[PDB]
Design a protein around this nucleic acid. Sequence first.
RNA 1: GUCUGCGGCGCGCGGGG
DNA 2: TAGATCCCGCGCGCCGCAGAC
Lengths: 919, 407, 408
Amino acid sequence: MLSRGLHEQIFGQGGEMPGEAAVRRSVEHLQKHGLWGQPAVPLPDVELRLPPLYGDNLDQHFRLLAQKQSLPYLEAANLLLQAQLPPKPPAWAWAEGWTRYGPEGEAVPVAIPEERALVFAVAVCLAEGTCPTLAVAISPSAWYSWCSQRLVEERYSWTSQLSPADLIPLEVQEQLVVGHNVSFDRAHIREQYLIQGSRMRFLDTMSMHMAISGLSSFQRSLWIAAKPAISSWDWLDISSVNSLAEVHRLYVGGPPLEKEPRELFVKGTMKDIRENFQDLMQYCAQDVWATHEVFQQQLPLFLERCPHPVTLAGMLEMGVSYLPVNQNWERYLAEAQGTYEELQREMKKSLMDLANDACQLLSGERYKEDPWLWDLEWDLQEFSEEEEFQQDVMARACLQKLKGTTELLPKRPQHLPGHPGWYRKLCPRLDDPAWTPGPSLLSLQMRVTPKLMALTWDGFPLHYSERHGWGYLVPGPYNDVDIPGCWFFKLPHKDGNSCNVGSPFAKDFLPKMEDGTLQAGPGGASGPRALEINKMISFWRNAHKRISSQMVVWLPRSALPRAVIRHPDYDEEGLYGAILPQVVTAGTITRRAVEPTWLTASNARPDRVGSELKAMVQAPPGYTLVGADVDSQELWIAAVLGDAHFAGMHGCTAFGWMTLQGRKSRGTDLHSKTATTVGISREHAKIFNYGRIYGAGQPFAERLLMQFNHRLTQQEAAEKAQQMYAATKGLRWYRLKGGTESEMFNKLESIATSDIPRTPVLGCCISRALEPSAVQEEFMTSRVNWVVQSSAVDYLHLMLVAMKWLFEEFAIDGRFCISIHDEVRYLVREEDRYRAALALQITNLLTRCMFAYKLGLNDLPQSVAFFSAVDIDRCLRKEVTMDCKTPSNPTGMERRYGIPQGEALDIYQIIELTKGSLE
Amino acid sequence: EGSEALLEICQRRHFLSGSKQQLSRDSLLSGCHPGFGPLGVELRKNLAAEWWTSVVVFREQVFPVDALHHKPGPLLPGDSAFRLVSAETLREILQDKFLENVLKTSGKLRENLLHGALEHYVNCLDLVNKRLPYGLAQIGVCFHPVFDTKQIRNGVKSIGEKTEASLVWFTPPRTSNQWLDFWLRHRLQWWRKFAMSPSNFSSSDCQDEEGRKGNKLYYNFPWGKELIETLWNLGDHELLHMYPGNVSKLHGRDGRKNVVPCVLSVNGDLDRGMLAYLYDSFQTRKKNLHRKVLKLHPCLAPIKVALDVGRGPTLELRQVCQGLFNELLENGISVWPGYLETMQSSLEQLYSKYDEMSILFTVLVTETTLENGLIHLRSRDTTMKEMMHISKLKDFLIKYISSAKNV
Amino acid sequence: SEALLEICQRRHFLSGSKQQLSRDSLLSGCHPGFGPLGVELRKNLAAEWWTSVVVFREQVFPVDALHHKPGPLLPGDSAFRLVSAETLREILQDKELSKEQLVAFLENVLKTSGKLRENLLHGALEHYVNCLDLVNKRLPYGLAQIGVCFHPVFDTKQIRNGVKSIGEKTEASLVWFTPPRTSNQWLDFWLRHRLQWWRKFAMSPSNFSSSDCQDEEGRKGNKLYYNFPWGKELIETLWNLGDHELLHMYPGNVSKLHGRDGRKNVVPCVLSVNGDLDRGMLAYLYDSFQHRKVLKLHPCLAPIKVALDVGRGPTLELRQVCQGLFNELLENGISVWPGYLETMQSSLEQLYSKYDEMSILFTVLVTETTLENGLIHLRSRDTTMKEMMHISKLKDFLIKYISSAKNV
RNA sequence: GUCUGCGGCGCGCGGGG
DNA sequence: TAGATCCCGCGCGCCGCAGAC
C-alpha cells in the first residue's frame, strides 16, 4: 500500500527496489507539470483467494494455460502440416450427402467424415438465397465432397437448420478446421448455431496472413498502383492484398491460380450450377488445395512469429462467437424498413411541395432576383322533355376530334409545355411510365434539391463546376460571398475551403445541421424537416444492405436444451435463432478483429432510424449476457509503457499520474477535462487525445481541429502549438520525443525501430513489409499505431485465455466470447451468472498485472486492478439503463433491466456453493 | 396574426363552415358551432369515406353496426350534473304527491357509441363463427355537455355535437398488446396521410387509473396540441359487467380454445380532424409567396374540378360544357358548375376563388374548343396552364385521383 | 307473406332477439337497430338517393342541421318530443305539470333547455340565407340532407300508463326554394322523379303508387305508399308548403329572404320532400321476397355483391389466390364476402341456400382447376345456372353487370 | 431533308465504410 | 492512426433512329 497508491497482492516476491535516484527523478518531475501534493481518496482494501497459479511466476502460469488450451488443436495442425495429399479424384460424385474419394477415385457414401483435421471450403449460389450448394474438403486420409442435396426440386422457403453441412461427430474430440475466410464456411457447417458449446475450433489463413507480413491501408494504394511523393519500394515483394490468389502466389511458389470467368455463383441460377458442376467443383478443389499449401507454409511461420502460445489460444477462442436473436431480428428489420420507407416518402412529398411552390416566381420574372434559383432555365415552350338534351351529343361534343399532333401526347416530345424547363425535366411522361402526379423523379442526390432546400452558409450553389458547393463563406469580383447573390463570376475563386476535395472531407454535414450554418431558412415549414429527416435516415440508408440479409438460422424444437424447458418463456410460438458475426480474427494491419456491421462504434442513439442495432441480441431463456468494458485500455497501456521506460513506480512519468488520479467528474482527466479546457471543443477532445497516443502528426491535428469548427489557419495547429508543445513534445534533440515533457512516447518509437518482435508483452512479431530493416521508410506513425493496437489485441487475448481457463477449471456454463470495441461479453447460464462476473474481475487482475510483470515492473495501482462495473443483462447495449428511439419504447421489445453489480459480486466465492445460496 | 384568424375568413366565407360570425375556436372544439357549410359537409363526408375504406374495408372481420342516438329509460344509474342539486331552496312543495326529481327514470342521449357496439357484440358473434379477432365500426354523432364556466352565463349546460368514428375490436387477451400497437401505428399512418406536414400528427402513451394502457393522438394546432383520437384497452371489464348472468354464452373461439375476449376501443373525432386538415392545408414571415390557397389532399378535397367558359363568340356553344359535366358526374368526379354566373369576373379572381375552395383543377372552354377541342387546364398545386384534349380528361382525372389514393 | 321476419332475424338483416322486433314497432322507430347487412343496405340506399337527388342536379347542396334546437324561450305550442333535449335526462313531453317552483317553467322545463328535432326542414330554412349567398341569389335551388329524426310513440302500452318512446327514423329530406310562379310545376316534376326513383329498384314497381292530398298549410300534397302486404303505409311525402313558413322565420327586416328569379326579386316558395329510408328499406326488402327462400334485391342495393369460397382441394396454396382476388375486388370497389376462410366445410347445398338468403349477386367457387388454368366457378343468384369463367375477367364481368343493372 | 422527339455507347465528378 | 476503392449515383458528350414542316 501507500507509495502514492498501490494495490494489495498475494503473489510475487518481496523485492521492492524502487531506487533512490529513480524516486528522486520521479518526485522532481512531478513537482512540475501536474501537482505533487494530493492525498486523494485511497480505495477500500480487498482480500481475495485467487486459485493456485502455475510455475514460479504468472508468466509461466499463462504460458502453461496457453499450451494446455492449444495442444489438442496444435497436434491437429501439425498432422495437417506433414500430411500427404492423394491425387484429386477424376470425377466428382452427384449423390446426396457426404462422399469420400479413396484411392483410384473410389467414391463411397458416408454420413459424416471421421477426421481430426481438414481444410474446408463452401460455395453458395445467391439466386436461392445464401444456402450452400457444394463443398469439398481434404484430410490426411482422403478427399470428401458434399453436393448440398439441392438436386431435388423441392420448396422450403428458408427458415431451416438442416440446410448447411455437417462436420461435428457425435462421439457417442478436437475437431480442428482450417480454411480461407473460415468464418464464412463455419456459417454453413451447422451445430455452431447450437446454444451449447462445441469443441471444434476454426483457424483462418487470413488471420495468419494479417499477422505475418500484413498490408497497411495506406500501403495498399501503392501496392495496387504498382501491381513529397518520394518513398522506398522494397516492401511490395513481401505483402499481398488478402486475396486467395495473391496470397498463394506470394507465400507458395507456383503458377497463378486461375479465376472462373462466368462467376455463376454471384450471378447465375441452379440450372447453370448443374450444367457447370464439374468445372465449379474443380475450381473449389483448386482453392482448397491453394489454401492447404498456404496453411502448410504459414503454420511454422505462425509459430515462429508468435512464439508465445497464448496468441494461438486467443485466436482459437476469438473464432467462436455467438449472437442469439430469438425471433425479434426479422421483426426488427421490418419495422426499420417500414420507418425508412415512410420517412423517405414524407421527405419526398416535402421536396415535391417545394418544387410546386417554386413555380410561382415565373409569374413576374421574380426568379431573376431570387438568390436561390436565379441560374435555372425557367424556359417555357409553346409550339321527351329531357331526351332532347339528356343525350344531345352525349360524348362531350364528340364532333371535337384529335387533328394534328398525336405525337406530343404519347411519350415526351411536347412534355408539359408552359411549365418551367427544370420542372419539365422533373416530371415523368404523361401516361406510359406509370405516371405519378407532381414533380416526381426528385431526390436528395440531384443538383436542384439543394437549390429548393437548405441554401445555407449565405450561398449553396451545389453545382458540379469542378468545385461542388462554391463559396468563400467568410468575411471580407463583387458578390463573392454576399447574401443577395447574382454574382458576376468574372474570375472563379475557391476561397475559404482551400483544400477543395484534397482533404478526406467525409460525412461532415450530418453534425453541422445542429447550428453549423446548415438550415433552410425562409420556408420555415418543410425546409428544415427534410434536413432533419435526412439526419434520421442517413444511417439506415447505407446500412440496411449489411444489417439486412444477415444469415439467421432457426434451431428446431428438438435441438433445444433443457434450459428452455421448465422456464416460463417456453413455446410461445417462439423461433430461436443465432447470428454468426462472420468476423475475421484478424483483418487489419494488427490482429484486431474486423467486422463492418458488428465491431463498429455505434449504439442506440436518438434521432436515428437504424440505431440500436446492437440491441435485439436476446439470449435464450435460462441464459444471460455478462459483459465488461475495459476502462481506458490504450491510454493506460501507453501510460504504463512510458512509466516503465521512466522508472518503477507508476506515478513517475506524469502521464500515468493524470490517468490514475484524474477522474471524469471533478477531475482534470485528458477526456473532457484537460484537453477541452486547453482546446475549444467539448467532448470531441476524447478523439483528439486518442489521436496522439495512437501516434498522429501535427498536420493531422490541425485538420482534425479544423473539422470541429470554422477557424483560419493561424489558429490551427501551426501557431497554436500548446498541445504539441506539451504532451508529445516531439523532435527533441541535444539530449543523449525523448524526455522534456509529461508523456513518454519515445519507447514506442524505440520498439518500432528495434527489429525485435516489437510486442513488449507477448512478443508477437511485426509484418515483414513494415520493418525498417526490410525496408527503410518514414512511416513512424503507422508503426506506433501498430504497437499500441498490438498491446490492445495482446490484452484481449490474455483476457480470453484467462476466462477460458477459469471456465474450464470449474463447472461454469459460460462460453461464446464476443469482443466489440474493447468490450467483452459472454453468454452464461443464470444459475452461475454472478460467478461468471467474478472471474471477469479476477481476469483484469492478472491481465493488468501481466502488463505490469514484463519490462521490469512488479507493482500496479490499486484503482486499475478491477473493472468499474460488470453488466449482467438479457441483451447487448452500451449501458444497462438505456432506451430505443424508433420503436415505441424498450418495453416493446423483451428488454428487462440488469444489474451492473460492482462490489456485490466480490462477496461470493468461485466454488459451486456460493454463501450457501446454491442448493 | 394570420394564423387561426385569417383562415376562418375564407372558411365561413367559402362555406367550409357555418357562417354566423362566430370567430370562436373553443366553440368549434366543443361542438356548439351552428354547423358546417356544404363544402365542410362534403369534406367531412370524404374524410368519413376514407376512414370507412381504410378501417372496415380492406380489412376482413370488421363489420358495420348502428347504435341508437338515445338509450332506454329505466335501469339507468347516475344523474346529470345540474340535475344533482338538493342543497336548499325547498320552500315550495305545493305540488300534490315516474315524475319526482331523482333522475325521473328518464332516458339519455349517448355520449359515446362504444356502448352500442358492446351491446351488439353477442348478436355480431354468429357471423364470424365465434372467431375472436374481429371488430365493429361506426360513424355517428355524439352529444356532450359543455359550459363557459362563468357563473351561469348560459344557465343550463350547453349541448355540443361531435361526429365520432369508433372501432371496437375484440381480440384474444394474449394478443391484445400487439393488436393495440398495430392499431395505433395504422391510425397514426392514416392520419399522417392526406397531410402536408405529417409531423404535426403526434402520438403519446397513457394509462388508466385501473392500470389499463392506451394511446392518445394529437394534432398540433397553432395554439397547441389538441386531442383527436384515443385508443383504450378496456380489458373486458365493461363487456363482462354488462353480461353478468353467465360466461358460457360469452365464450368465443381463438385458435382452439374458448375464452372471453379483450376489448380495445379506438375513437376518433371527425369534426376536430376535419378542422385539423383545414389548418394543415393552409400555410408566413418573409415567405414572399402570398397566394392564399387551401392545399387539401386530392383524396378528400370537397370539389375536384371547376368548369368554366371564356371568350365565347357563341353562348349557344356553351352546351359543350353540358354532357362533359355529365361525363365527369359518372364515376363520381365532383364538379363545381360554373359558366352559369355570367358575370364580368376576371380570370385572376376566378382562380383565387377556386384556390380558396380547394379545387384541384380549373377547366376552361374557349372559342378554340369547337375545332380540334383544347380546354385550358390549370392546376391548384402549381399555377401553370396546360392544353390537353377533351376526350382524355375524364380518365386523366380518374388516374390523378387514383394516383393520389396510394402514394 | 309470413315467416319473413324470421329470415330477417337470421342472417342479421334486422338486429334483435327472438320476435322482439315483431310485426309492429318496425313502422315506428321504437325497435333495436338493424344488423350489419341492414346497415349496409341502408347505406347503399342513401348513396343511391344522394346520387339521384344531389350530385345529378348541379343546384342542390348538402346542409348541416343539428340534432337539437336550443330555442331560447321556445313557444309552448309544439309536439315537444324532448322538452329537455339537453345532455342526458330527456323528460319526454310532460304535458301540464311543472306547477311547483322547482323545475318550473323558468330554468328547466317549458322547453327552455331545447328540443330534439323531429323534421329536417328547420335546418334547411335556417341555412336558406347562407345557401343563397353561395348560389349568388339564383332563386331555384334545393338543400338535401339524410339524417335521423325523433318522434313520439303512443298506445302500444309498454308498462301500465304509457311511457312513450323515441321513435328514430332515418329520413332523407329535400327543401326546394322555387319562385311562386310554376311552383306547382316543380311539385309535379319532383313527384314524377321521386316516384320513378322509387320504382327503379323495385322488382314489382306496380306496388309503388302515389296519391294526392289537400290541406290548409300547403297548396297541394302528394304521398307515396308502396301498398305493403297488410296495407298502404306511407314511405314518402311531398308538400307545397308555401313562402308563409319562410316568413315566420326572420320576422324582422325586409328584402332579405327574397332572391332573383328572371331578373326579378321574389320571396321564394318552398317544397318539402321527406322520404323514410328505414321504411324504404323495409319496402324494398319486402318486395324482394317471393319456392325457395331468396331475397331478390336490386344489384345496386344488395349489401354484398359477390362471395368467395373454396371447393375441396388442399387447404394451403388456395388462400393465396382467394386473398389476391379479394384484394383486387376491394381495390375496384366491389363488396365481397370472404367466405373462403370459413372452416368446418359446410354443406354445399346449405351454403348456396344461405348465400341466396343473404342476397349475394354471384357465388364464386375456387377449386384446383383455378391452379391448373385459372377458371373459377360462378353461380347466378336468380337464374341458378353455374358456369365456368376466367378468374382475371371476374372484376370486369361484375362491374359490367352492375352498370347494366343500373341502366334501364 | 432540319433541330425536334426516341435508343445505344462512352466520359467526367463525387460520397460509402 | 487508418483510410479505403470498387460502387452506385449523378452529371456531360457522340452516335444513330425517327418525323413533321
